[PDB]
Amino acid sequence: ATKAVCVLKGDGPVQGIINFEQKESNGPVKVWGSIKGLTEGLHGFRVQEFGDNTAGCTSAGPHFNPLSRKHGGPKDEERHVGDLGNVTADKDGVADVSIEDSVISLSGDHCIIGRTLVVHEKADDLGKGGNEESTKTGNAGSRLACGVIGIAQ
């Protein structure tokens, strides 16, 4: 049993705290928390490969993708390990996050600890946008906030 936590911060208003919990080494991972300072609507939400924020969110690189797959939604059979779809911000700019995912992990080779959680300007088109960027990143526009995923007590 493992827990992780991530504090998302950026250059603007977007700020949040995301908790991860995994009860068993191969089990589903529970992702929950809150992000605020968002424009109402859907925002791309994923894990980038590196826990590298030296030049801001760019340094974190491509979506975490150890199986060398194409970008997709979290319930698609072709996706990056890091692909967690969209979070939804309400009228107050608050995205209450409550995800379960069975592909990310807090141990083993899908371990996302030490990697970067990021929230984006626009919606993830889930790899269904009909262009090359869709199949790479989901066309979610610029990165608004990110942080390194750490071990939690």
71 makes contact, choosing from a copy of itself, Zn ion, none, with CB < 5 to 8 Å by partner type, with: Zn ion
Tell me the C-alpha to C-alpha distance, in Å, between residue 147 and each of 44, 59, 78. Answer: 15, 11, 25
Q: Alpha-carbon distance 115 to 117, whole Å?
A: 7
SS (H, E, C) 47-59: EECCCCCEEEEHH
Minimum gap (Å) between residue 91 Cβ and Zn ion: 28
Q: Which of residues 58-97 bind a copy of itself (CB under 8 A)?
A: 61
The one-letter amino acid code at 11 reads D
**What distances in angstroms separate CA 73 from CA 59, 79, 114, 129, one per listed residue?**
23, 6, 23, 12
| 153 near a copy of itself (CB under 8 A) | yes
User: Nearer Cβ to a copy of itself, position 41 or 59?
Assistant: 59
Residue 121, binding choice from a copy of itself, Zn ion, none, Cβ under 5 to 8 Å by partner class: none
Q: Does 118 sit near a copy of itself (CB under 8 A)?
A: no
User: Can you give the binding site for a copy of itself, defined by CB under 8 A?
Assistant: 1, 4-5, 7, 17, 49-54, 61, 113-116, 147-153
